[PDB]
Design a protein around this ligand. Structure first.
Ligand code: FAD
Length: 388
């Protein structure tokens, strides 16, 4: 029966715990593994918008998520001289409305994990080899130990090890949107109070905010550049590149970068999308960022994770565990919605920053209203199946 189907879920992020929840709810018995020692605190702020809110509510975690929501009261577009060009309330500023809500990743994962306390999960575990035939998937762990599963569902992030292990270069594209993103936490030297400031130029923008930690501020950088690092993983090269890339930006960049060396949660990566004709191969399926990351410019990453988790578990349910039928349904039903939200992210990468002109209240406001409407449109551009 479905209960006795062995399913390995790799990655305790959003998609992994999400798909584990729905699989369990739909009569299956999944198990989770995680490379990290434990759930990482805080981190990037995730949007739960569109249909993802409906899924969250059915999961019985929506009120919990709201209890832990970000509490930015005010967002401001400012020029390099610190003048306020355009101001908006927090939710509107983040292009959210209605029941939509923003929550830090770590907080959301903790909530997700509490919702699946009955599901076996093993941290500090890593898969080093995967092999499958028609009957089974053989998983080799770090210590050389081996186990067999009927199915493996990998939710191990945009830099998916599993994707590289299972798929060839012809079976997926890493789509570069010609821009970089960086973020780190610093002392709230400005004394921001549940407020975010955003300053921008023709190719770059810098954000600075404080929210749930009063004596801390989260700095953000987004910019376009065709430059390539000799080693994109080299944190020292990242900080040198970022500093040199913003040396003449003005505004608070000097004050922010002066505090960068002492920040301990530094993050830097290219803005990238994962494009796959098929998210699956035999008994293995990718999900979440590993399968179809829409990049931070889309704001749809979380949305796609929840929807993917719901549909995949659903189609497996309807197929009574027949993964071949389910995986096909998984690819067909979900791709257009993924592609829609990915194209939105691409659009943001190409037209959010003013090409020629300097920002003003009129532009900031019109652009804000336009993005709010458009994101609402794409985030709801799928008709969610009812598996129950
Ligand atoms: C700077 C930034 C800002 C963002 N902003 C937004 C936003 O505003 N709105 C939005 O909707 N989305 C945003 N996103 C995207 C969003 O964070 C993700 O799409 C979402 O968390 C879903 O990710 P996931 O669960 O598929 O994988 P992840 O959240 O990356 O989790 C993967 C998990 O698997 C683990 N793992 C990794 N490799 C392995 C391995 N080999 N073996 C075992 N475990 C492994 C990781 O430690 C992690 O816990 C942003 C992303 C970034 C980087």
């Amino acid at each position: 029966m479905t209960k006795h189907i062995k399913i390995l879920v790799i990655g305790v992020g959003v998609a992994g715990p999400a798909v584990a929840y729905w699989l369990k709810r739909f009569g299956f018995s999944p198990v989770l593994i995680e490379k990290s020692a434990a759930v990482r605190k805080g981190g990037q702020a995730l949007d739960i918008r569109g249909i993802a809110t409906h899924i969250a509510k059915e999961m019985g975690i929506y009120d919990q998520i709201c209890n832990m929501r970000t509490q930015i009261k005010c967002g401001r577009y400012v020029d390099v001289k610190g003048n306020v060009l355009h101001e908006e309330q927090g939710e509107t500023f983040g292009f959210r409305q209605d029941d939509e809500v923003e929550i830090l990743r770590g907080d959301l994962v903790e909530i997700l994990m509490k919702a699946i306390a009955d599901i076996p999960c093993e941290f500090k575990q890593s898969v080093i080899k995967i092999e499958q035939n028609e009957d089974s998937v053989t998983v080799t762990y770090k210590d050389g130990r081996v186990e067999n599963y009927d199915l493996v569902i990998a939710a191990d992030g945009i830099h998916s090890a599993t994707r590289g292990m299972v798929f060839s270069k012809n079976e997926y594209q890493l789509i570069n949107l010609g821009s970089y993103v960086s973020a780190f936490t610093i002392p709230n030297y400005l004394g921001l109070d549940h407020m975010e400031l955003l300053c921008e130029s023709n190719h770059k923008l810098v954000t600075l905010q404080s929210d749930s930690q009063a004596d801390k501020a989260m700095a953000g950088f987004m910019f376009r550049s065709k430059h390539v690092l000799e080693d994109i993983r080299d944190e020292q090269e990242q900080k040198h590149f970022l500093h040199a890339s913003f040396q003449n930006f003005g505004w608070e960049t000097q004050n922010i970068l002066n505090r960068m060396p002492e920040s301990d949660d530094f993050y830097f990566d290219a803005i990238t999308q994962i494009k796959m004709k098929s998210w699956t191969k035999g008994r293995i399926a990718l999900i979440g960022d590993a399968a179809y990351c829409p990049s931070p410019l889309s704001g749809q990453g979380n949305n796609l994770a929840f929807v993917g988790a719901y549909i995949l578990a659903g189609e497996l349910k309807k197929a009574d565990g027949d993964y071949i039928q389910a995986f096909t349904r998984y690819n067909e039903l979900l791709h257009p919605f993924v592609e829609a939200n990915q194209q939105f992210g691409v659009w943001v990468s190409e037209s959010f920053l003013l090409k020629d002109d300097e920002v003003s209240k009129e532009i900031a406001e019109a652009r804000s209203n336009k993005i709010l409407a458009m994101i609402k449109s794409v985030s709801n551009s799928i008709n969610l199946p009812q598996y129950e």
